[PDB]
Amino acid sequence: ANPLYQKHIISINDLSRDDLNLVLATAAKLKANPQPELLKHKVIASCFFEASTRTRLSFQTSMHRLGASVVGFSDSANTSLGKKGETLADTISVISTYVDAIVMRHPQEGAARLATEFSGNVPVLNAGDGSNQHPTQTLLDLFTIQQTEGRLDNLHVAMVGDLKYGRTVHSLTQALAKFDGNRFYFIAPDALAMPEYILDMLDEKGIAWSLHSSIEEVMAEVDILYMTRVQKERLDPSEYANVKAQFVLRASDLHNAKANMKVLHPLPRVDEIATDVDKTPHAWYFQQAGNGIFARQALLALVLNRDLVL
Amino acid sequence: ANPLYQKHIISINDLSRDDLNLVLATAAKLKANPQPELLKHKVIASCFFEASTRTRLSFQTSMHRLGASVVGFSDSANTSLGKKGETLADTISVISTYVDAIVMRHPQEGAARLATEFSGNVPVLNAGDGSNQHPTQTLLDLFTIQQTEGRLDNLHVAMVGDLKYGRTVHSLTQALAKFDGNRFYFIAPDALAMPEYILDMLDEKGIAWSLHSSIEEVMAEVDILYMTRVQKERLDPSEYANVKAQFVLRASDLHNAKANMKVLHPLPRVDEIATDVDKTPHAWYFQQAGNGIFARQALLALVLNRDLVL
Amino acid sequence: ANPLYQKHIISINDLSRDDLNLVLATAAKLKANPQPELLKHKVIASCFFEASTRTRLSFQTSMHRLGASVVGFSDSANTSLGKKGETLADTISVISTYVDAIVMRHPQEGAARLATEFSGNVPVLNAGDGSNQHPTQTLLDLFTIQQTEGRLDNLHVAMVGDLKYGRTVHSLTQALAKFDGNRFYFIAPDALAMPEYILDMLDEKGIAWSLHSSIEEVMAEVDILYMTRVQKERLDPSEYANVKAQFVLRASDLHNAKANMKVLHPLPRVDEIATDVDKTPHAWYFQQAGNGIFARQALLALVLNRDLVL
Amino acid sequence: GVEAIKRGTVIDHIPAQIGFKLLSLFKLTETDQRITIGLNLPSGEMGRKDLIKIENTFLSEDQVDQLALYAPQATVNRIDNYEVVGKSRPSLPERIDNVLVCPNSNCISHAEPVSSSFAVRKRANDIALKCKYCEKEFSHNVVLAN
Amino acid sequence: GVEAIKRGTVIDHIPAQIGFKLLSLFKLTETDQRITIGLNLPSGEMGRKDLIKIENTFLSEDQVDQLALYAPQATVNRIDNYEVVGKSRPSLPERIDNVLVCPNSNCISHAEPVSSSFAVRKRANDIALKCKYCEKEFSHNVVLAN
Ligand SMILES: [Zn+2]
Ligand SMILES: [Zn+2]
């Protein structure tokens, strides 16, 4: 069967350059030639114990666009985990007896890994576990970055914002230290700077990374400007010092930007990317969000079908 | 047409040994041979004005696994019963004009019977009306008990826990006083003991029932140990004396248990069934929850199709 | 020099048969002939960290009728203990650098004893600490019993209500055990019963007590019937079965009562003494309340004056 | 000798699964001196006993009065230059300060900066213990619940 | 001079100050075996060592390796009827499960009924630990808490 059939997708740290590449190739196919019945007769749980617009609705629209049924919850207030007091472990145990795959969003890091101990033979796809991982975010980023820059190796990538609680940037910095000669510039506050553990993995593979205090310092050199939102709900009250985007970007700044360059952002965007940037050639965040459709249906297909689609 | 086509399912007190038996036979069939299009072109309301994991998601997964559409709500906060102030009676009256069957969960006993006065020709299936009935719970219990013990007649059944607000045990004690020579041991606190009305029905059919203060007293004799959770939300503040499971069960106790014996629990389980019991041969609650799929699709099929499936 | 001069009046245990009788003798005297400037130039702290009408307003009026000055609070809400977060130990420390004696009410048991370890030289007089001691209550009750029975030896005293959490009945069963030949009768919900520690002591001194389910079973034998309130605010959740008054005195029950018999109640009373009892020659809890002025005048006089001649 | 020391203490007839709590409680590892612990050795009458040997170190008052409430069986031995200068058993005190924690949730002892104190009646049944602050008396077992 | 042992396990060469920390960390005392512990002992090799003999008890492959986290210079002597049948020695384990607690407050491992586990890693001065679940690496020192 194919490299990822029945495989749970929890962290980017568990996939190779090769599984990533499969997923993008299959998205490339699937965008060109739809597969309406590919999962006809499958039912998938969409379980968000956290909030979502993008990940919930792109995953439930992708399942729908391959013939599958969706059952689930957008909120935990009315589950019995929500009012009768059950453990995650039993939610997952009973939901395993019903649906063929589980997509789950959760506020505690490790919820998805915990869910695989109990999902039985059912795959658990991680829609984001607190501030740890967001593996399917990374897949539509890689898709979008290659779609735009032509490659995924030898890119100057700046990651601006909350790198501490940025589940998006944890997974993306790990996915891109798999391809070669990629360059990182990390522009955060100190409080909310990139995790140490990440940088270790970076030193060990000899990847060139560097901290910076200005978009202006990186503007000319960069290819992908990846912008984040301060993870407001995830901050410590000691950290409330920086709830407003230190770095905020306007179209002015794009003055000295490389013609190829693309501004990527996971969204929501609150104050950090000014609406004037929306008219530029560089703005690519609404494009990156639609690429959530194909990367996300590429995925489902690979985990619930043995036969790699074409 | 078959014995239950268009029949509302509100209380176990309105069905015979015969309707129960039909439902289990049809589940037995349906588990062996799926019927993907059986309800292709049907739309069912899933209306929970209460909380749920198991009953909502098993009923919406069963409908999906027979080709039907589901419309509805998991919460009443955003309906117009929820914010514009409507009566149940008009929710039910307008929802009858749209969907072919209504599954409804509600916090007041009698909500479902009230809904049949207004659902028109549409069947109303009771997902649980406060602490009165839970008829489809009983059906996956009967399925599971027969699946395990081989029979549904001449069983020593102990029901441990909150027997007062146990909508599950109200319906199950009524379903099993239809088959013969079944034996009951009721282990509750006094405050939360089995309803009088139940015991009457038991005296009249000469069923052998008996109260007990210990699992240890029943262990050797029993076949089905049916465990309940204290209905925390349903208690009187005078009753808050016993919010913790008086009887809590650990694997130790299974020391003197009958080889055949199965531990059944409707779930959620909070403190009452210790996680070590999960490794035993006797633990059968995650199995009983998956049997919610087939009993629940057996049901839908019988109420919305004339022709008894095969 | 007088014996209670400078004393901390915390627990009835600490006070003796003679300290008690010295107050009452004093009391009868300031009641016979008043002392309007006895405490002229003394300033006293009224510290009520818990609600009061009687204990605070009686204590305060006493202070004024002796010429003393009051400073204090009615709630910690406003203090810097309750807003800026200082400890009670620090609070009692600065307040003892200001006044001549401290009167305090307080929700935790033992606050009173803690205050003394930090008041230095200033006498601390306990207005009640949670469910423990209420010694100024007792003094006024002893005063009121004396006036009516003419004796504090050989009585038949019935205590009815919440004996567990009642500090009034704690203090009162300890002062009366200091007198000769007193018969006790406890009438409580057993979950709201007399602490075994008091009972041990009553047994250690060979005094006779007895539990009773009725009040009509003892009306005939009593001199004093002391009613109490269920301490809602102190009750634990297990005890909410116990909020409404069990035993409730009505004017009709007094029917076979000794003509001398008095109904005493600390007050406030909720539903336990029907107001029809107020129109009887047995009701006396309002008289008793008035007698709190003379015993609190007595006690202040004795602790703050080195020799009294009156 | 079944282990040996010049000066020091050897505590004996310690109940099983009590010696290790005792090592914990009296901080007996905050020490640089030789220690021998005989975990779960015997005691003919009462099967197994733990035994602790603190070389050239002796216990203070506090610790032995604790040792009474935790081990009314043990016998503590003052060994100077190998002679058992004295071998004394514990008698309970009047009052235990600063180690017991009052069962009363609403006891002021908790919230405020005060060293605890407990009064000790010897109930024919057991050991009744009284809080200095809330004046509630408890079973020694209610209190010593580790 | 401590004791003669018929058959079992003798972890010798524990750094003095760690023998008590070990008997606590890995539930070694929760036994009915005779344990004899020499805290603070003259070694020469180390000025002072500690030493534990657990009679009629053996440690597994992984069991012994867990000790390297606290005691890589320990030597675990496997003994069968007075013969030093074995001289086992802890490498770093690849995972210590069920004995540690993640420094991350918002990890799932606290709230849910699952054993803990950490991928052990030799970093560049001390040993780094990565939680299975939240996947954050912590200094091993930190992991041993406050
Ligand atoms: Zn206390
Ligand atoms: Zn963790």
Swiss-Prot record, chains A, B, C:
InterPro entries: Asp/Orn_carbamoyltranf_P-bd, Asp/Orn_carbamoylTrfase, Asp/Orn_carbamoylTrfase_sf, Asp_carbamoyltransf, Asp_carbamoyltransf_Asp/Orn-bd. It catalyses: carbamoyl phosphate + L-aspartate = N-carbamoyl-L-aspartate + phosphate + H(+). GO terms for molecular function: amino acid binding; aspartate carbamoyltransferase activity; identical protein binding. Pfam families: OTCace, OTCace_N. GO terms for biological process: 'de novo' pyrimidine nucleobase biosynthetic process; 'de novo' UMP biosynthetic process; glutamine metabolic process; protein homotrimerization. Its EC number is 2.1.3.2. Coiled coil: none annotated. It is an enzyme of class 2 (transferase). Carbamoyl phosphate binds at R54, T55, R105, H134, Q137, L267, P268. GO terms for cellular component: aspartate carbamoyltransferase complex; cytoplasm; cytosol. Keywords: Pyrimidine biosynthesis, Transferase. It comes from the Bacteria. L-aspartate binds at K84, R167, R229. PROSITE patterns: CARBAMOYLTRANSFERASE. Heterododecamer (2C3:3R2) of six catalytic PyrB chains organized as two trimers (C3), and six regulatory PyrI chains organized as three dimers (R2). PANTHER family: ASPARTATE CARBAMOYLTRANSFERASE, ORNITHINE CARBAMOYLTRANSFERASE, MITOCHONDRIAL. Belongs to the aspartate/ornithine carbamoyltransferase superfamily. ATCase family. HAMAP family: Asp_carb_tr (MF_00001). Catalyzes the condensation of carbamoyl phosphate and aspartate to form carbamoyl aspartate and inorganic phosphate, the committed step in the de novo pyrimidine nucleotide biosynthesis pathway. This is Aspartate carbamoyltransferase catalytic subunit. It comes from Escherichia coli (strain K12). The gene is pyrB.
From Swiss-Prot, chains D, E:
InterPro entries: Asp_carbamoyltransf_reg_N (IPR020545), Asp_carbamoylTrfase_reg (IPR002801), Asp_carbamoyltrfase_reg_C (IPR020542), Asp_carbatrfase_reg_C_sf (IPR036792), Asp_carbatrfase_reg_N_sf (IPR036793). Binds 1 zinc ion per subunit. Keywords: Metal-binding, Pyrimidine biosynthesis, Zinc. Zn(2+) binds at C102, C107, C131, C134. The keyword Metal-binding applies. Belongs to the PyrI family. This is Aspartate carbamoyltransferase regulatory chain. It comes from Escherichia coli (strain K12).
